[PDB]
Amino acid sequence: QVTLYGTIKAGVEVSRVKDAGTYKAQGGKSKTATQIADFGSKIGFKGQEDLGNGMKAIWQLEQKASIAGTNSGWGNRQSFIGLKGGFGTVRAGNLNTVLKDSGDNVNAWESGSNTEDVLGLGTIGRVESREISVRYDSPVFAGFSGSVQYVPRDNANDVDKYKHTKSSRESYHAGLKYENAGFFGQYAGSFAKYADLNTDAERVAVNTANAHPVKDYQVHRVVAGYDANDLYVSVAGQYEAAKNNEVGSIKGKKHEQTQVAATAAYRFGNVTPRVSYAHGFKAKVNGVKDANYQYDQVIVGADYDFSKRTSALVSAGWLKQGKGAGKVEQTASMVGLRHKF
Amino acid sequence: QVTLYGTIKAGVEVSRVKDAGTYKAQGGKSKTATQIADFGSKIGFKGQEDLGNGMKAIWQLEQKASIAGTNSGWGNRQSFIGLKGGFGTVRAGNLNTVLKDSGDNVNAWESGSNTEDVLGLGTIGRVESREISVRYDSPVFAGFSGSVQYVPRDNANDVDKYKHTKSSRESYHAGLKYENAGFFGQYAGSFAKYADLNTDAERVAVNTANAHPVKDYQVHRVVAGYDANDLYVSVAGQYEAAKNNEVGSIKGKKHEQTQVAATAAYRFGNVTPRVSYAHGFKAKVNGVKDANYQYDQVIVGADYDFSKRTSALVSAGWLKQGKGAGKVEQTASMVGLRHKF
Amino acid sequence: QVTLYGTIKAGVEVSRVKDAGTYKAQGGKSKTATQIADFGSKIGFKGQEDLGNGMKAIWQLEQKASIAGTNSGWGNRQSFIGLKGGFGTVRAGNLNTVLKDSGDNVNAWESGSNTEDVLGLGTIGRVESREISVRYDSPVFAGFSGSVQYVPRDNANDVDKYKHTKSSRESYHAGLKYENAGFFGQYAGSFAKYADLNTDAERVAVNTANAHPVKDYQVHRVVAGYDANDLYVSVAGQYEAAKNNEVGSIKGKKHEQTQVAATAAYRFGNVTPRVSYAHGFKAKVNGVKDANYQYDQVIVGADYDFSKRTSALVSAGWLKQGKGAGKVEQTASMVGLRHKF
C-alpha cells in the first residue's frame, strides 16, 4: 500500500476577551472578533510492506496544510519509519508523545489556533508535543497495551552535541491502556531529568527567549471512561511537577499544578451533542501558590455527520483564567465543517 | 474521488528594459537578459463526496510548485472546503477573488514572474488576488450565473481583531456572467470601504511598508467576446477608483484609472496564433493627472498543442510605461513548454 | 502515467570529533554524540505522456522530506519538464549536474547531514550540485552514452541580469559513459569561466558571505569499475583547478586539488558488506601547498535487504583531515533503515 489521506477542516469563529489589564473599553471587555479560521487541515502519505513471516515495514509523512495557506514544511506532523510484527511496533521520527496520543480521549473539540484554549481543552493539552524520538508500542494483550518512548540528549539539544556542557534534556515517555466492553482506563506520563518551560508551563527548546530551566520535570495523566452504545464519557486527572533550575534566588523551589477534565457526549442518529468541563487548580510556583494558573472552562456543542467522513460542527465555550484583577475571561463560538479523505 | 492534478510549465525568456533613469549605457537601454524561468508550475489535491440527495462535500489544496525550487508552502494557491448541490456552491478558504477568475478571459499568456507585465497583460491584472474569504457561486440559469464573495474585517486585519482601532478592510466581491452560442459577457467587481494600495495600485496588507490607505476602493470590469468554432475574441474594460485616506495634506482626494484590453486568437489544427493589446489611460492621483500610470502594450505569439495536455509556447511582447523621461520600455520574448496532469 | 515515489530513510548515528583547536578535554577529543537522524528522505511526483510517433513529454517534481520535519519547499530536489524520444532526452529545471549523477558510482553510503563527510565520501562529492539549467542526454549507442548541460549567465546571477557588470558565472557540464558486460567507465566534468568557492572548495552563489571569486574553474572526474555477478568495484580519480579571481595581492594564483576514491562490495544473498577508501592530496592554494586540504578516510559497513525496497543499514567510518595541530579526526557509526516507495 501507499495511501494519500488527510482532513480538511475550517469554520467561522466568534470570540471576545475580557481583560482589565489590556483592554479598558467597558469593564475590560475587548471587541468581538469574527474570523474564518482553518481548524488544522493536514495531509499525509503513508505505506506498508510485508517483509515475509509476520513483519512489515511502515512509514508515514504527514504535514500541516491549512486551507488558509499559512503552513509550509514536510513532516511537521507525525512522520516516521518503523517496523511492525508480532513483537508490536517500533518507530523513529517526528513522533507524537505518548501523552499527545492520550489527548484523543481528553479533547474532542475542533477550532482554529486562536480559540484552542476556549473552544477546546487547550490548557490541559499544554504538556502534549511531537518529538524527534524512538517509540515502542506493544500488541494488545488481554485488554492491555503499552508504550515507551525516548528523546535522546543530542536530539533534545543539538548545539551541545560534542560539548556536553548543558545538562541533558533527554526525556522518557510511557503509557499503559486497558479496554474492556466499552470501558477504558489509561495512564500516560513523561519524565525529563532536565527541561525548560515557558510561563504557560509548556516545554520549549533550550536557550529559547524567556525559557525557564527546570529539573525533575514529570507529568502524569489518568483518563478513564466509557465509549460504546452511542454513549461517551471521559474523566481525566493530570499532575505536573518540577523544581526551579534557573541560576538565582529561587533555584530548587517547586513548581506544580493539577488539572482535571470531563466530557460527555451522546449519539442521536447523526447528531452528537457534547459537553466538556475542565479546571486547573492554583499552581505552586517557586514553592508559592499562584492563582494566575487556576482556570475553569466549559464547552458545549454538537457534530452533525453528513457521512462517516464529513461532519458539520458547532460549539460554544466559556473560560476564566486567574483571579481578581489580572483575571482573564474568554468567550467564543464557532460553526464549521470537517472532511476526512 | 481524490485527484492529484497540476501544471508544469517553464521556458526560456529574453528581455530588455529601456529606462534612462536606472540605465545610462546607450540611450537608457539595459543589457539583454536570457533566463530559464518557471511559468507558475502548481500541484493540487482535491476531492468530493456525495452526501446523499443532491449535496456534495468539496475540498481542494493547491500549492505553488516551481520546478526551479523557489516555492514553499501548502494551500498558497486556491484552497478550500465547501458544499455543492442544487443551490449552487459555497466555499470558504484561500479563494480566488471573482475578479481573479474573470482574468481567465483577459490574460491567456504564460510567462515567468520577471516578464508578467510584458509577456502577459499583467498591469490589468493588478486588481486580482486570492483572499481568505467565503464565496457563493450560483448554478447556471438560462445562460446566466453569478458570484458573491466576502472578506471579513478580522481576516483582512488580524492584529486589530479585539481592538477595532483601525477602519475595516473588509471587502465584497461580485460577478455576473452570461453565455450564449459562443458569445459571452461578464461583469466582475469589488468594493472595500477601506483598503491599502502600493504605488503600483495593487492591494497590500494594512501596515505594509509604503502602503497607502484608501477609502471607497472600487474596481469594475466588463469582458465580452466570442469563444467557439476555432475563433477567440475578447474585449475588456476596467475602472478603478479610490479616495486618499492617508493622514496629511491630500486626504480625501481621488485616485482613478481606466484600462482596456483586447485579444484575438484562431485555431488552425494544432496551432493557435494569438494577439493582445492593452492600454492604461493617464491615472488621476490625488485629483491630478499622472501620466506615469499610462501604458501601451502588445503581445503576439502562438501555442502548439502536441496533445490536449501538452503545449509548446512562443510569444513576444512590447510594453511602454509612462511619458517623457521617466518613461520605461520593456521588450521580451519566450519559448516554453506546458504540461497539465 | 502519474507516479508518487520516494525514499524514507533514517537511523541512529554515533560520532566523535578530535580537534585540539576547538576541544581541550583529553587531547582535543570531543564528547561522543548519539542522534536520531533522517538520512535524506524525499518524495516526488512524476509523469510522462506519449505525444505520438516516438516522443514523450516528461516532468518531475521532487522534494526534500525529512521525517524529522526540518525541510520545507517544493522542487528543491531534481525537478524538471522535458521531452524524450529517439533523439535522446532534453530537460530544463532544477537539474542534477552531470557530476552529481556520476556520484552514484562513487558514494554508495547513507547518513544524516551531520555525518556526510565520515559516514559517506562527502569530500569528493563537494563538486556536485543541482542547478537551474538545460540538459541533453543521448540514447545509449553501442555501450556509449553522454550528457551536456548548461547554466546560463542570468540564472547563475539574477541580480546582474540587466547590468552585466559582474563576470558571467555561467557553466558547462558534460559526461561520457561506456558500459560492457558489467564493466563501466565514465568521465564527468564541468567548466565555468568564472565561479565562486567557499573555503571548503564548494561552489557558492555570487556575493555570498566569505565567497572567493575564481576564474577558469574546472572539475574532471573519471570513474571505472565492475558491477555484476554479486560483485561491485569502483575506482575514481578527481581533479579540481581554478585561478584566484579576488581583487588583491594573490589574484591570478592557482588553486588545485586531486582526490581519489575506491569502493568494493559483495552480495551474499541478502547481505552486502562494503568497504570504501578515499584520499585528498595536499591542495595548492594561491600557488602554495596547503596540507589543510589533505584527507584520508575509510568506511566499512553492510546493507541487509529485507526486500527490494526495504534495507537495514550499518556502517562505521574514520576520517582524518589536515596535518599536525590544525588536524581534525572524525569517527562515526550508524544503524539505519531505508524504505523506497
Ligand SMILES: OC[C@H]1O[C@@](CO)(O[C@H]2O[C@H](CO)[C@@H](O)[C@H](O)[C@H]2O)[C@@H](O)[C@@H]1O
Ligand atoms: O481524534 C479525535 C478528534 O480528531 C478530530 C478533531 O481533532 O479530527 C482530527 O483528528 C483526527 C484524529 O483521529 C484526524 O484524523 C483528523 O484529520 C483531524 O481533523 C475528530 O475526528 C475527532 O473528534
Ligand SMILES: OC[C@H]1O[C@@](CO)(O[C@H]2O[C@H](CO)[C@@H](O)[C@H](O)[C@H]2O)[C@@H](O)[C@@H]1O
Ligand atoms: O486558463 C487560461 C490559461 O491558463 C493557462 C496559462 O496560465 O494554464 C494555467 O492556468 C490554467 C487554468 O485553466 C491551469 O489549469 C494551468 O495549470 C496553468 O498552467 C493556460 O492553460 C490557459 O491559456
Ligand SMILES: OC[C@H]1O[C@@](CO)(O[C@H]2O[C@H](CO)[C@@H](O)[C@H](O)[C@H]2O)[C@@H](O)[C@@H]1O
Ligand atoms: O543510488 C545509489 C544509492 O542511493 C541510495 C542511498 O543514497 O538511495 C538514495 O538514492 C537513491 C538513488 O537511486 C534514491 O532512489 C533513494 O530515494 C535515496 O534514498 C541507495 O539506494 C543507493 O545505495
